[PDB]
């Protein structure tokens, strides 16, 4: 059970896709039921994912 800012795959989306629920569906895939993106500049923010969740991976748009 971990919480933080999960990204997509190459961090090409500033660690946050775009819409609010747009990150909840992907976060839910990582078991992060409560997953919402800050529509401002705080990247995505989901809680309830595994310790191996992919968040704060750093690295510029890898794609």
Swiss-Prot record:
Molecular function terms, GO-annotated: calcium channel regulator activity; sodium channel inhibitor activity; toxin activity
Protein origin, superkingdom: Eukaryota
Keyword tags: Calcium channel impairing toxin, Disulfide bond, Ion channel impairing toxin, Neurotoxin, Secreted, Toxin, Voltage-gated calcium channel impairing toxin, Voltage-gated sodium channel impairing toxin
UniProt note on tissues of expression: Expressed by the venom gland.
InterPro entries: LCN-type_CS_alpha_beta_dom, Scorpion_toxin-like, Scorpion_toxin-like_sf, Scorpion_toxinL, Scorpion_toxinL/defensin
Pfam short name (any one): Toxin_3
Domain LCN-type CS-alpha/beta as annotated: residue spans: 2-62
Disulfide bonds: 12-61, 16-37, 23-44, 27-46
Any single Gene Ontology cellular-component annotation: extracellular region
UniProt KW Secreted keyword: yes
Protein's GO biological process: defense response
Cell compartment(s), UniProt: Secreted
Membership in a protein family: Belongs to the long (4 C-C) scorpion toxin superfamily. Sodium channel inhibitor family. Alpha subfamily.
Function: This neurotoxin acts on sodium and calcium channels. It acts on Nav1.2/SCN2A and Nav1.5/SCN5A sodium channels and slows their inactivation. Also binds to Cav3.1/CACNA1G, Cav3.2/CACNA1H and Cav3.3/CACNA1I T-type calcium channels with high affinity and inhibits the channels by modifying voltage-dependent gating. Also targets neuronal high-threshold calcium channels, including P-type, N-type, and L-type calcium channels (Cav), and others that still are unidentified pharmacologically.
Other observations noted: Negative results: does not affect Cav1.2/CACNA1C, Cav2.1/CACNA1A, Cav2.2/CACNA1B, and Cav2.3/CACNA1E calcium channels.
Domain remark in the UniProt entry: Has the structural arrangement of an alpha-helix connected to antiparallel beta-sheets by disulfide bonds (CS-alpha/beta).
Protein name: Kurtoxin
């Amino acid at each position: 059970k971990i919480d933080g800012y999960p990204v997509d795959y190459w961090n090409c989306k500033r660690i946050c896709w775009y819409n609010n629920k747009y990150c909840n569906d992907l976060c839910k895939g990582l078991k992060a039921d409560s997953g919402y993106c800050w529509g401002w500049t705080l990247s995505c923010y989901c809680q309830g994912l595994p310790d191996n969740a992919r968040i704060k991976r750093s690295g510029r748009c890898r794609a």
